[PDB]
Design a binder for this molecule. Structure first.
Ligand code: ATP
Ligand code: ATP
Ligand code: ATP
Ligand code: ATP
Ligand code: ADP
Ligand code: MG
Ligand code: MG
Ligand code: MG
Ligand code: MG
Lengths: 70, 254, 379, 288, 73, 97, 70, 49
């Protein structure tokens, strides 16, 4: 069921996504991103993600209307 | 294990709120309302969440902000100050007394003019003389006039402000016309401070014509303004350094 | 005496007011009057709503409607809502619109100016007159032009004559123009604006008149004010290249100053003090009697005066006994109170290279010889 | 102490501060504002008409150009007669169905120009000496035609429009105008010569343009160009576009007191002190 | 193609176009020289092109440009 | 292509560079091709090094034009005929052999 | 003289990644999209090291004057 | 009246086998899916879709 939950997360990564730009961590799962919509955001990061490919200034995907860094 | 898996099954519902806008606090009102500037948009006066004091809100710090009601959800970690940043866009690379050598006599003199009045102001109040501000260096270009200036500020432990006027700094500082005292607004907050010039004509005699005194404005004002600037004369932490190549050219008013 | 015979009636006015309010609160909803008012005020934060969008009032329609410009710049013909002082609604003012309904809930905020932090000064200039040595005529017309009309406005009214409007302090550099400025900033306790004459030239065209417009406006908002302009020469002699149109743009900057210094717009209670050391290069129309009324001149000090100055900076020091004040004064000649303080300051410093506190007769010889090459060299 | 008790209880039963009003009458206003929420047409998003497709047709159409800067074909008003709204006229539309509703209050553009309007100063015609032809010339051409317009039309003439005041500094060019400014009791709009020098190319000319648009509506104005030397220049070529900016603003001022533009009935004072500088086409009769 | 009218001021240049545009009845397009100078790049170019295109829709037309000194050398 | 230089200059936050970049794309595909530009002086000024935003804004579209003539992406069957009545004002790099 | 001449040579023999950008590509219509366009060309050079980036003209990018109002 | 409009953008760069990265007309870039009736060889960094 830990495995189940990891299969169940997936849905959030449903296409289509909005490419944005990671800016900086905050806590151990929340970060500051910037859509290519112009705005910034303070969103939850999706658990189970290579936590440290995340930093440099890497491109990321946000979940259209919720903006979760998936 | 139960707790962990419970979290991950519940998470999919946590990831549905529309997120949060990051604005910056401009300044607070009294009614537990705060004036906040949302990055890509205008400004909004907003309520604050009860868990964050109105005393932790401070003009210029970054704040989260609910994606609908716009309350101050949580204070973000990253405060943003330009003088801290601007100085890194001039890249004037600070050095040490070990790097400037073969000057010596000069090093020892600026220590009597900048180091002593910052560290031991009691020596000039006891002697009975007013603290000195203007300090003019001069010699052919590339004799270490800036190299020494960078250092002196590094051992004294003051903020070092290269002034140049370039419009790039005016994004960090404010508006051109009034921008004079506007610099002293940033120096004073990080005092003690050494505002630093770089009188051009370190490249030619075309900098001594066609305009007729282009960088001798950054000091005929700074310095005229630095005898009677606010109530900072009591504790004088803001020196000013300019450096030419030719000491004959300075405008007689200097 | 009579003032309490007046009180005995003022109180009754208030006791009556208390009758009405104390009864009509309980007639309203059997509660305090500020508790009913607080029921309403919380209900107004229901109307007001959260957030509150800042915007620009562009124009007022008499009908209690107004065209405002939100952040986007999109205009909206909205309505002017409850609990708004319509006398705080001028064009260009920042207003609080409802984020959702877009109607001016009002200007419930103290919109700030960052130009007043530059122009105004919250000083305490240590130098008061009595620290200006031996220039005494100078010390007074000034008091008759600035300080005295604010202390004793009954003399001028009793005589039946307007107080004089502005002064120009002019003379050779160093003599004490800006020192007199420090003195009168200290005392009067009027709002004291201060702008150097050079600051009236900036890169982009047209701002010259604009900066000049907004300098007086500031000083008008805070009346009674003093507007000192240190070194008004720099507007009209030294230039900076940055400005466009060259000298023609300098003129229109001056013509603006020249109007809003006299002009048409019925101003009042803003003194003006213009310092300068080139007065012969000012457009006469600027210093026309009735625009500026008194031209104090600052000649180089005498010999006995030049001794009171050199005696005033040395007063905070401890001089060795071999120091003859009268030998160092006459030694040089044609000293400004700036040169005097420059010889005092240097020598006192020579004593700080030696770790002493006795400025010796030789500290003043080295000093006097390093301010003379200073005057001789770099000319 | 007792007058301080007076203030204490005044606050205990009114209470004001950094609050938007005195809070005394607006407590009921509140209950009219709950009728301002029901007012659903409000908010009304403001735009401008630019082109009427059909007018004689049963179905008028318009082309609204809103502030999001997308353009819509729209219906006519839902009540206001379709005779009122011509093209150009700024007009407010509803934001849901971009339905034109309320004609304006046009020429927003007046923002700085707004502030040139005057509120009567404190000098009268007795406070001025040298009352020769000096002041009797000026009244004759600027004050008398607005108080008694019947005696100029019965004779069959038309009095002259503009009046140039010029003299050495401090001889009452402004004083004699501070004077006429209040006694006239007709709309008075003085511009300061330097305030028409703007930053951006041909913004100055816009300023002038908006100034007469505003003065033609208000029937019978004065405009009092004080100290015109800025934008008072005289055409000339030499070098790299000398004063080409300011110069063009003047051509706009010239052009609106003499072009085709009949113009309403607005008088104009110009007080220089350096008439030697004014452009001849600005100076000759029929404009001054 | 088009006639110029130049000379001293006030001799009656603007008076002749008034009389011309009221006696002929054609489509007469009034344009003053400083109305074409806009602050936004190229917008002054657009208004000129529009003017001539609006004159072709209404042809036969007469465009009277006043104050050619607002477009110097 | 017959191109009056005054028409490919508009006001939309750096859009006027697009048409030059675009006007060339079009030529490369349909080559052979001639692009004629009448009164090149409109977008072929000097340089200035002091002017306003309007001027630093045309100075981009020019600089752009000057790199689509001789950057890397060499042109092949494209011909271009400029025309002017004042070639004293043209940027020396536009008149460079 | 052969600025663009010489870099054109150096772009044949470089035996490395070579990312060539036109001076004006950095500007564009959509607001904020300039900064994101810059970040990209470096995060691409970073990954593909060793790499030369070559901007053909820096006359639209690093000019001496800036009007803060436009 | 049954048809609608489609948003014109460009293919910035193919990601996996089925997800592309396309840019809108303005900016908002997307990770997007695609009709399986399209020749995946024609879609390539540069083309419009
Ligand atoms: N008559 C004087 N009595 C006492 N001190 C003086 C006198 N004149 C000048 N000083 C000293 O010199 C210092 C600088 O002089 P001040 O600022 O008055 O020069 P200034 O005449 O304004 O010169 P500038 O023409 O450059 O404005 C003063 O702070 C003061 O201590
Ligand atoms: N004829 C007069 N009668 C009474 N007072 C006069 C007369 N002429 C000038 N004055 C006085 O001169 C003062 C200023 O005059 P005013 O400013 O009108 O001159 P001006 O022509 O406007 O000069 P400027 O060109 O400097 O604006 C007035 O306040 C007034 O007291
Ligand atoms: N030749 C004429 N016959 C009759 N009246 C004339 C004549 N010339 C001028 N006028 C009168 O003089 C007035 C001014 O002339 P007008 O406005 O045509 O000058 P303009 O040459 O167009 O001006 P500018 O050179 O300043 O642009 C006219 O309104 C007209 O009443
Ligand atoms: N040293 C040389 N040997 C051979 N050919 C040369 C040399 N220098 C220049 N050229 C030739 O002259 C042309 C000019 O050089 P290039 O095109 O690199 O100009 P550039 O310096 O990039 O000019 P710009 O300043 O316009 O960017 C080249 O295309 C080439 O034909
Ligand atoms: N006395 C010195 N000791 C060490 N390096 C020096 C010295 N003088 C000059 N240099 C070198 O020359 C560079 C330029 O000198 P600097 O005085 O900073 O420039 P400027 O010409 O603006 O005065 C320094 O950064 C340093 O590398
Ligand atoms: Mg002084
Ligand atoms: Mg006057
Ligand atoms: Mg005419
Ligand atoms: Mg090249």
């Amino acid at each position: 069921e830990f495995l189940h939950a990891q299969e169940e997360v997936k849905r959030i990564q449903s296409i289509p996504l909005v490419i944005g730009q990671f800016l900086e961590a905050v806590d151990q799962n929340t970060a500051i991103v910037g859509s290519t919509t112009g705005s910034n955001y303070y969103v939850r990061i999706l658990s189970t993600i290579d936590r440290e490919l995340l930093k440099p200034n890497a491109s990321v995907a946000l979940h259209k209307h919720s903006n979760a860094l998936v | 294990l139960n707790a962990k898996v419970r979290l991950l099954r519940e998470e999919l519902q946590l990831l549905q709120e529309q997120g949060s806008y990051v604005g910056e606090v401009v300044r607070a009102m009294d009614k537990k309302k705060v004036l906040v500037k949302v990055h890509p948009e205008g400004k909004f006066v907003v309520d604050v969440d009860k868990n964050i004091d109105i005393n932790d809100v401070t003009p210029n710090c970054r704040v989260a902000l609910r994606n609908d009601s716009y309350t101050l959800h949580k204070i973000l970690p990253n405060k943003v100050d330009p003088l801290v940043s601007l100085m890194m866009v001039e890249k004037v690379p600070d050095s040490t007394y070990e790097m400037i050598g073969g000057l010596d006599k000069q090093i020892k003199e600026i220590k009597e003019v900048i180091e002593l009045p910052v560290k031991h102001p009691e020596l000039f109040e006891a002697l009975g003389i007013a603290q000195p501000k203007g300090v003019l260096l001069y010699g052919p270009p590339g004799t270490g006039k800036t190299l020494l200036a960078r250092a002196v500020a590094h051992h004294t432990d003051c903020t070092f402000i290269r002034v140049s006027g370039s419009e790039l700094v005016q994004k960090f500082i404010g508006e051109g016309a009034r921008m004079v005292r506007e610099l002293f607004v940033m120096a004073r907050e990080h005092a003690p401070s050494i505002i630093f010039m770089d009188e051009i004509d370190s490249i030619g005699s075309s900098r001594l014509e066609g305009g007729s005194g282009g960088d001798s404005e950054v000091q005929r004002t700074m310095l005229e303004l630095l005898n009677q600037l606010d109530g900072f004369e009591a504790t004088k932490n803001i020196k000013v350094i300019m450096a030419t190549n030719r000491i004959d050219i300075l405008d007689s008013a200097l | 005496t009579q003032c309490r015979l007046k009180l005995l009636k003022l109180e009754r006015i208030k006791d009556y007011l208390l009758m009405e309010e104390e009864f009509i609160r309980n007639q309203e909803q059997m509660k305090p009057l500020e508790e009913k008012q607080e029921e309403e005020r919380s209900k107004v934060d229901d109307l007001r709503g959260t957030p509150m969008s800042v915007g620009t009032l562009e124009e007022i329609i008499d009908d209690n409607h107004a065209i405002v410009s939100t952040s986007v710049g999109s205009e909206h013909y909205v309505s002017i809502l409850s609990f708004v002082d319509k006398d705080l609604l001028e064009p260009g003012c920042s207003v609080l619109l409802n984020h959702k309904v877009h109607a001016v809930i009002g200007v419930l905020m103290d919109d700030t100016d960052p130009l007043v932090t530059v122009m105004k000064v919250e000083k305490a200039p240590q130098e008061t007159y009595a620290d200006i040595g031996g220039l005494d005529n100078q010390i007074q017309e000034i008091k008759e032009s600035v300080e005295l009309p604010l202390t004793h406005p009954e003399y001028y009214e009793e005589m039946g004559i307007k107080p004089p409007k502005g002064v120009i302090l002019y003379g050779p550099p160093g003599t004490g123009k800006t020192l007199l400025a420090k003195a009168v900033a200290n005392q009067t306790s009027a709002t004291f604006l201060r702008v150097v004459g050079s600051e009236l030239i900036q890169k982009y065209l047209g701002d010259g008149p604009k900066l000049v417009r907004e300098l007086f406006r500031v000083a008008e908002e805070h009346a009674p004010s003093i507007v000192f302009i240190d070194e008004i020469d720099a507007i009209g002699t030294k230039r900076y290249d940055s400005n466009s149109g060259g000298e023609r743009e300098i003129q229109r900057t001056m013509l603006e100053l020249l109007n809003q210094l006299d002009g048409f717009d019925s101003r009042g209670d803003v003194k003006v003090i213009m310092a300068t050391n080139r007065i012969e290069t000012l457009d006469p129309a600027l210093i026309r009697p009735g625009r500026i009324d008194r031209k104090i001149e600052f000649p180089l000090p005498d010999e006995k005066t030049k001794k009171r100055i050199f005696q005033i900076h040395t007063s905070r020091m401890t001089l060795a006994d071999d120091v003859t004040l009268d030998d160092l004064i006459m030694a040089k000649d044609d000293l400004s109170g700036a040169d005097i303080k420059a010889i005092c300051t240097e020598a006192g410093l020579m004593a700080l290279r030696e770790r002493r506190m006795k400025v010796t007769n030789e500290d003043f010889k080295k000093s006097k010889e390093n301010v003379l090459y200073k005057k001789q060299e770099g000319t | 102490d007792d007058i301080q008790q007076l203030l204490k209880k005044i606050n205990e039963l009114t209470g004001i501060k950094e609050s938007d009003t005195g809070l005394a009458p607006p407590a009921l206003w509140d209950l009219a504002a709950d009728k301002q929420t029901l007012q659903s047409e409000q908010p009304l998003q403001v735009a401008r008409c630019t082109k009427i497709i059909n007018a004689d047709s049963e179905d008028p159409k318009y082309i609204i150009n809103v502030k999001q800067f997308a353009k819509f074909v729209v219906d006519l008003s839902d009540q206001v007669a379709p005779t009122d709204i011509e093209e150009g006229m700024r007009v407010g539309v509803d934001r849901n169905k971009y339905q034109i509703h309320i004609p304006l209050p046009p020429k927003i553009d007046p923002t700085v120009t707004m502030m040139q309007v005057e509120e009567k100063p404190d000098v009268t015609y007795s406070d001025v000496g040298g009352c020769k032809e000096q002041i009797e010339k000026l009244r004759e051409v600027v004050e008398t035609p607005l108080l008694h317009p019947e005696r100029f039309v019965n004779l069959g003439i038309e009095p002259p429009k503009g009046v140039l005041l010029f003299g050495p500094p401090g001889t009452g060019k402004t004083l004699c105008a501070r004077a006429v400014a209040n006694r006239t009791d007709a709309c008075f709009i003085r511009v300061i010569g330097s305030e028409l020098v703007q930053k951006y190319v041909g913004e100055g000319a816009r300023m002038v343009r908006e100034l007469f648009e505003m003065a033609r509506t208000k029937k019978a104005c004065l405009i009092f160009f004080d100290e015109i030397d800025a934008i008072g220049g005289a055409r000339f070529d030499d070098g790299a576009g000398g004063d080409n900016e300011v110069q063009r603003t003047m051509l706009e001022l010239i052009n609106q007191l003499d072009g085709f533009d009949p113009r309403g009935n607005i008088k104009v004072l110009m007080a220089t002190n350096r008439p030697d500088t004014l452009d001849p086409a600005l100076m000759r009769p029929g404009r001054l | 193609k088009g006639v110029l009218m130049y000379g001293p001021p006030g001799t009656g240049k603007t008076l002749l176009a008034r009389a011309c545009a009221a006696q002929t009845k054609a489509t007469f397009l009034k344009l003053a020289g400083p109305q074409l100078v806009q602050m936004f790049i190229g917008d002054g170019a657009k208004l000129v092109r529009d003017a001539f295109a609006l004159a072709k829709e209404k042809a036969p037309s007469i465009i009277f440009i006043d104050e050619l000194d607002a477009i110097g050398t | 292509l017959k191109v009056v230089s005054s028409s490919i200059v508009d006001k939309y936050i750096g859009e006027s560079a697009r048409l030059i970049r675009e006007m060339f794309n079009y030529a490369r595909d349909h080559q052979p091709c001639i692009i004629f530009m009448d009164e090149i002086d409109a977008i072929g000024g000097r340089r200035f090094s002091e002017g306003t935003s309007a001027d630093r804004e045309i100075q981009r579209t020019l600089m752009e034009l000057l790199n689509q003539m001789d950057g890397f992406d060499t042109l092949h069957r494209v011909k271009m005929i400029m025309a002017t009545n004042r070639p004293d004002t043209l940027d020396p790099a536009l008149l460079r052999p | 003289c052969g600025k663009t001449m010489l870099a054109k040579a150096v772009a044949h023999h470089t035996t490395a990644a070579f990312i060539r950008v036109v001076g004006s590509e950095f500007v564009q219509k959509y607001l904020g999209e300039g900064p994101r366009m810059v970040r990209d060309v470096f995060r691409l050079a970073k990954e593909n090291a060793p790499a030369i980036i070559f901007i053909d003209e820096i006359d639209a990018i690093a000019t001496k004057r800036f009007d803060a109002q436009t | 009246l049954q048809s609608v409009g489609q948003i014109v953008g460009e293919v910035l760069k193919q990601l996996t086998e089925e997800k592309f990265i396309v840019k809108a007309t303005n900016g908002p870039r997307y990770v997007v899916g695609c009709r399986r009736q399209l020749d995946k060889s024609k879609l390539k960094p540069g083309t419009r879709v």
